[PDB]
Amino acid sequence: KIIQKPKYLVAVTGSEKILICEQYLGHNAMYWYRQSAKKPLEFMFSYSYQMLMDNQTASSRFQPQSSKKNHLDLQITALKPDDSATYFCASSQDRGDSAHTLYFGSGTRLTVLEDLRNVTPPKVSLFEPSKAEIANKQKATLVCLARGFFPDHVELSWWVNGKEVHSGVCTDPQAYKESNYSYCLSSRLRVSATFWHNPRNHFRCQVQFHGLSEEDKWPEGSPKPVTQNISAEAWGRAD
Amino acid sequence: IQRTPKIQVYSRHPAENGKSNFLNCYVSGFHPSDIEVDLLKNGERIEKVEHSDLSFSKDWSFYLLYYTEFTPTEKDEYACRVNHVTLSQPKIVKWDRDM
Amino acid sequence: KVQQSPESLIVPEGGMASLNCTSSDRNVDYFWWYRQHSGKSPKMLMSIFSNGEKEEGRFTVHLNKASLHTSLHIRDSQPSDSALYLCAARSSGSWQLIFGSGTQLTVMPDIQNPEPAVYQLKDPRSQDSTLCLFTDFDSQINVPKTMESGTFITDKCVLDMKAMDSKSNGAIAWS
Amino acid sequence: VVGAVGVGK
Amino acid sequence: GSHSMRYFYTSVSRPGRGEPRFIAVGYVDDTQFVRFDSDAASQRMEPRAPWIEQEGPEYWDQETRNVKAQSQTDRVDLGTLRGYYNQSEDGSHTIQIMYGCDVGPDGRFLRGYRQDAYDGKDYIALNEDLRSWTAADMAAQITKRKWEAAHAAEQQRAYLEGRCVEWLRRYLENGKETLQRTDPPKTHMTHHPISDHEATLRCWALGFYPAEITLTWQRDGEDQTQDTELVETRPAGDGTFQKWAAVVVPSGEEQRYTCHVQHEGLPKPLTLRW
């Protein structure tokens, strides 16, 4: 539908970033909206036929790029932590004052940090099912904890015998702050008592972390927190 | 699909020799909109001739008003010359003040 | 500009959900109702451009131009309806939808046979690490929250295996 | 003020 | 009495010569008050009446953006309609749009309208109920289906009954000195002998406003429509209008004919005799 890149983006206070948005639907109007805890959908820009129609951002640091057709990239200079939000690109077939339906892109989640030294990948722990649950309810609930990561740019998935599964899975919709510069996230997966007692089946919790890009600077005293996958796994047992 | 312009050339006020006036050429009922109109003094084209903004009537035919300041005299002849795609030759219509 | 009511609504499965939205702009003559699931994009649910009711399935949108008011009625509320519902308007002449603060709707599933239990789970790859699992409790149960520092308690998370009445409420705590 | 609705033909 | 605000759009494609030519003009009754020309150097909506210059810079910035976007809407529509009719890329084509609202003497909405043309003939038009469209041909039926799915009628009706009526009232208030006037025509009569047995009598009407007027001839009190020449009403160039009506009468019978002038500004219909 509408393509937005990247999915996650981290930046330091005062840097510049470009959010890319393009649609190949022949739509003549494109818009930018911002989603925060405060306002779930604050309007930013409205463009018709690549011309600027309205702008409700009180800051001149937000500068869209519409010279190319089907594109409405968004450049943000002098970034501030108050700019942290999910930026939604939208388009519509007809011009802005006459459109009957707006289609929204998948969004870019932007976090602006005071200092990049606090960016840390998660630690992943896999807790094995309680023997009392297997005995009483004949079901086995594995639980996956992701802790000590920052910022909140994580995607958790469950893998059984090399395949990602969705059935019997519930993951927290939002991460919770452990401290000022660390988040935590939980999820659980429930299988059979028979499926857990099979030593052939093995279960892996995978946390994909979105961190620093290959262009950000980092001191040589520690591994730079790049985008990476952290996992924890266990095998079924007849116990 | 194409319509010939109707042409009237006249003054804004009743013409009096020596008193300043406005010479008008009103073209209407024509389609398409491309049209050239000149105001002629003694056969020579007058410069700095203004014209109205293009509008159209109920039947979608266009109309325009070309005008310029002029002072009538006993000897000077005036006219307007209209060219349009429906015209093989430009149509010159002389100003008849005693009409 | 666009006001929505209420800010959050908890409805039992199969129950009625009434969402309200008003505007103060006299040049607003129509509204849009958008729905956004957590972590997804907002998608258009209903639009209405004239006075009266407009019904599509279990959803009915109402428009009252005199009182500048629109309401979204949801009958037979399903757990999948749990989302952020957003009301939008666009006064004649303006060039964009302006959205409200939204109504967070939560539809709790009907758990037929609740069997509350608390289990303890251990991480074998590292000691000094244990958590607690509160599972299979009733939908109306108030899961306690944490004010202590160093302890965390999650919100109710509903999973569904491939079985009958397989719905199961869960919560996790650790320190 | 102008106000022709601009849905593409 | 009643009053109208109307806008007239003209878009002419210029194949091989760049963007189409777009011209927009705004009228209150018979008085033009704004204009936009896509080929002008200003690239702005411009004032054409003294009373509209009172509007602040927000007004002109808004109308300029809005009318520039309309020029792009018509540019795309030209391409779409060029495909609907299987026409070539070489020919030049025209799209025309007229719309506006009327208010009664009480200042309230009376009627709205919007009409679109292609190459000088009807294309699509909003019906008088402001809720449905009339399409002139199969191509316009395609446009009609898009406009119904997009609720264009409801969006057009909300403008016609709202902002159109509202701003028309402000305009009438700002230009109250010149828009609410009725200049009666100044009438006279000319006589030109054409041959030895006939002559032309011409009945003149000058400086009247609004433009509507009726010049009729009678012979011995009986209305005569034969041998009657009647030109179209023309603008004097200062807001007033002109018109004449002529008859070819036999010589010596000039006093058997009377000219009758009817205008809104006349307390009683004028009668003229040579």
Specify the CATH number for the domain of residue E67.
Answer: 3.30.500.10
Same domain, E115 and E235: no
How far is A91 from chain D, CA to nearest CA, in Å? 14
User: Same domain for E166 and E206?
Assistant: no
Residues spanned by the domain of C126: 117-174
In the PDB record, what is the listed experimental method? X-ray
* E246: CATH: 2.60.40.10
Q: Is any Cβ of chain C less than 8 angstroms from the Cβ of D3?
A: yes
Element (H, E) at A16: none
B and D touching (3 or more beta-carbon pairs closer than 8 Å): no
Helix axes E57-84, E138-149, angle to 10 degrees: 130
In chain E, the number of structural domains is 2
Contact predicate E8/E25, CB 8 Å: yes
Do E59 and E159 belong to one domain? yes
Say yes or no: E119 and E217 in one domain.
Answer: no
Does residue E273 sit in the same domain as residue E247? yes
According to DSSP, the β-strands at C103-108 and C8-12 are parallel
The number of folded domains in chain C is: 2
Assess if CATH 2.60.40.10 describes domain A2-114. yes
- Any chain E CB within 8 A of the CB of C59? no
- Asked if the Cβ–Cβ distance from C92 to E155 is below 8 Å, we say yes
Query: Which of E125, E155, E181 finishes a domain?
Result: E181
Task: Write down which residue in E181, E214, E234 finishes a domain.
Answer: E181
Instruction: Give the resolution value in Å.
Output: 2.4
Question: Does A97 contact E68 at a Cβ distance shorter than 8 Å?
Answer: no
E120 and E246 both lie in a single domain: no
The reply to whether C74 and C11 lie within a common domain is yes
Question: What is the C-alpha separation between E45 and A183, in angstroms, rounded?
Answer: 55
Domain locations along chain A:
2-114, 117-235
Question: How far is residue C92's CA from residue B73's CA, in Å, rounded to a whole number?
Answer: 56
Distant-in-sequence, close-in-space partners of C86: CB < 8 Å, separation ≥ 6: A40, A41, C4, C33, C34, C35, C36, C42, C99, C100, C102
Domain span at E188: 182-274
CATH number at residue C135: 2.60.40.10
Query: Do residues C96 and C29 share a domain?
Result: yes
Q: Are residues C104 and C122 in the same domain?
A: no
How many alpha carbons fall within 13 Å on the CB side of residue C2?
30
CATH class of A117-235: mainly beta
| Residues from chain D contacting residue A100 (CB–CB below 8 Å) | 7
Three-class SS state of C119:
strand
Q: Which residue of E has its CA nearest to B22?
A: E237
C-alpha triplet A88, A90, A93: angle, nearest 5°:
175
C-chain residues near A190 (CB < 8 A): 159, 161, 168
Residue with tokens 């391409």: E79
Whether residues E149 and E213 share a domain: the answer is no
Separation of CA E198 from chain center: 38
Q: Is E132 helix (H, G, I), strand (E, B) or coil?
A: coil
All domains of chain B in start order, with CATH: 1-99 (2.60.40.10)
- How far apart, in whole angstroms, are the C-alpha atoms of residue C108 and residue C169? 10
Tokens linked to A78: 């002098």
Distance of alpha carbon E187 from alpha carbon B87, whole angstroms: 35
Using alpha carbons, select from E22, D9, C43 the residue that is nearest to residue A90.
Answer: C43
Number of H helices, E strands in chain A: 2, 20
Amino acid letter, E210: P
Q: What is the C-alpha to C-alpha distance for residues B10 and B30, in angstroms, rounded to an integer?
A: 19
Residues C166 and C140 in one domain: yes
Nearest to B70 by CA among B6, B20, B31, B1: B20
